[PDB]
Structures are given as C-alpha cells and as structure tokens.
Design a protein around this ligand. Structure first.
Ligand SMILES: CO[C@H]1CC[C@@H](n2c([C@@H]3CCCC(=O)N3c3cccc(C(C)(C)C)c3)nc3cc(-c4c(C)noc4C)ccc32)CC1
Length: 119
C-alpha cells in the first residue's frame, strides 16, 4: 500500500515484545544472542570485517522499548539480521549456528499471527 498504517509505540511493544520473549525463553539456544557479540572477549578479530551490521536480542529489546520501530516489518528485519549474521559468520556444525536455526523456527511460528493481528 501507499498509505503507511500508523502504529503507536505501546501498540508495537504489546504486540511484538511477546515474540521477542519467546526467543529469550529458548535455553540454551538464546544464550549466545542475549548480548552483543564481543570480538575482543571472544578472540575473533575478523568478526566486524565479516558482519557489517551487528544485531542481538538486547539491542532489539532496547529499540522496542525506545520506540525506534515505526512499523512491525522494521522489527522483523532486525530479528532476521541477527539470524543472518549468525548463519554468515558461524560454521554450520557450531552450537551458535544450530541455535540460530532453532530461534528462526520459533520466531517464524510466533510472528505470523502477530503480523495478521497488526494488519
Ligand atoms: C552469557 O554471556 C556469554 C558471553 C559470550 C558467550 N559466547 C560464546 C562462549 C564463549 C566461550 C567459549 C564458548 O564455547 N562459548 C559458547 C559457544 C556457544 C554456546 C555457549 C553456551 C554455553 C552459552 C550455550 C557458549 N561464544 C559465543 C559466540 C557468539 C556469536 C558469534 C561468534 N557469532 O555470532 C554469535 C551469536 C556470541 C556469544 C558467545 C555466550 C554467553
């Protein structure tokens, strides 16, 4: 459509925060995603050469709390950025990669009914 639907920050928080909570509830799978990747502590100095736009759950949460998403697709784009970054950087046998794949399965199931409700 040409006409932006207008969303209030608290409407987005009430609708979308439970979908982010569903990812946090996955344990162990969300544990690597709860804070930003720290390449110094992890000893991976190539990380920001490969991942140009880092993203993690705590940043998405803060963006929802501070009204930085005008529309739900911007939130979905950040969750997907987090996933794509982890699939790009990590080997397919790693825990982080397989945990990412489980988070993406969970998010897909939670986000669809929410998007139907916001349209
Ligand atoms: C709570 O604070 C901590 C601090 C960081 C820690 N962290 C680990 C640790 C480091 C020690 C060795 C080990 O083995 N780690 C490890 C690896 C996988 C799983 C686990 C669990 C035991 C937590 C499940 C540990 N590596 C991570 C890799 C990434 C990553 C990369 C690269 N690119 O995208 C992502 C996402 C992000 C965070 C990581 C997770 C949590």
């Amino acid at each position: 459509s040409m006409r932006k639907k207008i969303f209030k920050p608290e409407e987005l928080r009430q609708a979308l925060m439970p979908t982010l909570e569903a990812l946090y509830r996955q344990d162990p799978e969300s544990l690597p995603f709860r804070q930003p990747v720290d390449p110094q502590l992890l000893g991976i100095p190539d990380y920001f050469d490969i991942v140009k736009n880092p993203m993690d759950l705590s940043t998405i949460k803060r963006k929802l709390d501070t009204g930085q998403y005008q529309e739900p697709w911007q939130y979905v784009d950040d969750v997907w950025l987090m996933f794509n970054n982890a699939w790009l950087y990590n080997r397919k046998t790693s825990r982080v990669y397989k945990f990412c794949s489980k988070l993406a399965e969970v998010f897909e199931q939670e986000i669809d009914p929410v998007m139907q409700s916001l349209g």
